[PDB]
Amino acid sequence: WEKRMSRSSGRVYGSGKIEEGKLVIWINGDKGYNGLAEVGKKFEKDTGIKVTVEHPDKLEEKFPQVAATGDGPDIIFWAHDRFGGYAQSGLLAEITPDKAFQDKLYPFTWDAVRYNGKLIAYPIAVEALSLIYNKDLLPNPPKTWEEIPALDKELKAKGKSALMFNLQEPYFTWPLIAADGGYAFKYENGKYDIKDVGVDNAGAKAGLTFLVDLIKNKHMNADTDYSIAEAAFNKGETAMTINGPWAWSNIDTSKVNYGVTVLPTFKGQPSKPFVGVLSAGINAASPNKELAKEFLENYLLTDEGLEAVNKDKPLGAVALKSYEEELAKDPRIAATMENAQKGEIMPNIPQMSAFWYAVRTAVINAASGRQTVDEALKDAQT
Numbered sequence: 001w002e003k004r005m006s007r008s009s010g011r012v013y014g015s016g017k018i019e020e021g022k023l024v025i026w027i028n029g030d031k032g033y034n035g036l037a038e039v040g041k042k043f044e045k046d047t048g049i050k051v052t053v054e055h056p057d058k059l060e061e062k063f064p065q066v067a068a069t070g071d072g073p074d075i076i077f078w079a080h081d082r083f084g085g086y087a088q089s090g091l092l093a094e095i096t097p098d099k100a101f102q103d104k105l106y107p108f109t110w111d112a113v114r115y116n117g118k119l120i121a122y123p124i125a126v127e128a129l130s131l132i133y134n135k136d137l138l139p140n141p142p143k144t145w146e147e148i149p150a151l152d153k154e155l156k157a158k159g160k161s162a163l164m165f166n167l168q169e170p171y172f173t174w175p176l177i178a179a180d181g182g183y184a185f186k187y188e189n190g191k192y193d194i195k196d197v198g199v200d201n202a203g204a205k206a207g208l209t210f211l212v213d214l215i216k217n218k219h220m221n222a223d224t225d226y227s228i229a230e231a232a233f234n235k236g237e238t239a240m241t242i243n244g245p246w247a248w249s250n251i252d253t254s255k256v257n258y259g260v261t262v263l264p265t266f267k268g269q270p271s272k273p274f275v276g277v278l279s280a281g282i283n284a285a286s287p288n289k290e291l292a293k294e295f296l297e298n299y300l301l302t303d304e305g306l307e308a309v310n311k312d313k314p315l316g317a318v319a320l321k322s323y324e325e326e327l328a329k330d331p332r333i334a335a336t337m338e339n340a341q342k343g344e345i346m347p348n349i350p351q352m353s354a355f356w357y358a359v360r361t362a363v364i365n366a367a368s369g370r371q372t373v374d375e376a377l378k379d380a381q382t
């Protein structure tokens, strides 16, 4: 009864699900996938190996599902935080760059893709949220979160608003939650403590309460998502937004005269955005691991490869030492680094998936009023 009702009963996955002799790459739709496809086409021109870049919706949830059956892309791009879960499930190949190649990338970026002593992805770029502001509406961005309500009252009189950003993904609210003490998992003595979650302490509660108060006082709307905030800022309807380097391209196209700067402080403390390392993992069921290695090491992670992607959508602070130096001049990147400094590198442990889902629910429910801050964060905690 037990076996025969389960899909696992005498189950052997089919062969040839992932096509040998080509590369399929998944990357998020807010990244420079058209630029990545340019690198892929160069690879095809040189080597005859076709590269297909796709940007599926919710790829970070689709990948573990399809890869578990030996299907999916040869290469998956995502922030490093999801990869430990993939690795634990046996979905990622350990990557084997030689010492010469490892020397080309910053050591801390290799650390972000290390799991149980193994490298499980290639690091590409360091991402951190910054405060983005309309210099025409706001020549001087606020130093503190606390002064934003007063700013909104000013701009509401002019038919504008102070601030809009994605409230549907907890990634964007985390800088405020972590500012005065909130944390995900406590890193102590070489390991994250999965029983030590800091989403319901005094600091986290204070931060989320300030967010909820902004909404209660009609300075923000609870259902604002990525597209709503991006559209509003790039139309010049709101003075500020919170976003990463990938967003700069659309603002460059917009008519907005904008700047990128340090996130405001909360209770005198710097906002602490979670830092992500955009990373490329190789599917453990791929028959093309040698092709993937060649593409990633000798085509993408070069000055020419990163330039192609960066020209589509800015990567931020790239992990490649040689190319990072060329872009260090950019004040937007400098601001990105400053915020990344003040923040924390995301854990990559398998528990991150559940953590993000819990905090997503908590932030959405607190913001919309489905739950109080105390109720919401209590649930998020273990």
Ligand SMILES: OC[C@H]1O[C@H](O[C@H]2[C@H](O)[C@@H](O)[C@@H](O)O[C@@H]2CO)[C@H](O)[C@@H](O)[C@@H]1O
Residues within 6 Å of the ligand: 028, 030, 060, 079, 080, 081, 082, 127, 169, 170, 171, 172, 244, 276, 356
């Ligand atoms: O909001 C939870 C979400 O946060 C992070 O995702 C970021 C990603 O790192 C960025 O590159 C960009 O695409 O925005 C995303 C948020 O919408 C985590 O990496 C992710 O695992 C988590 O679910």
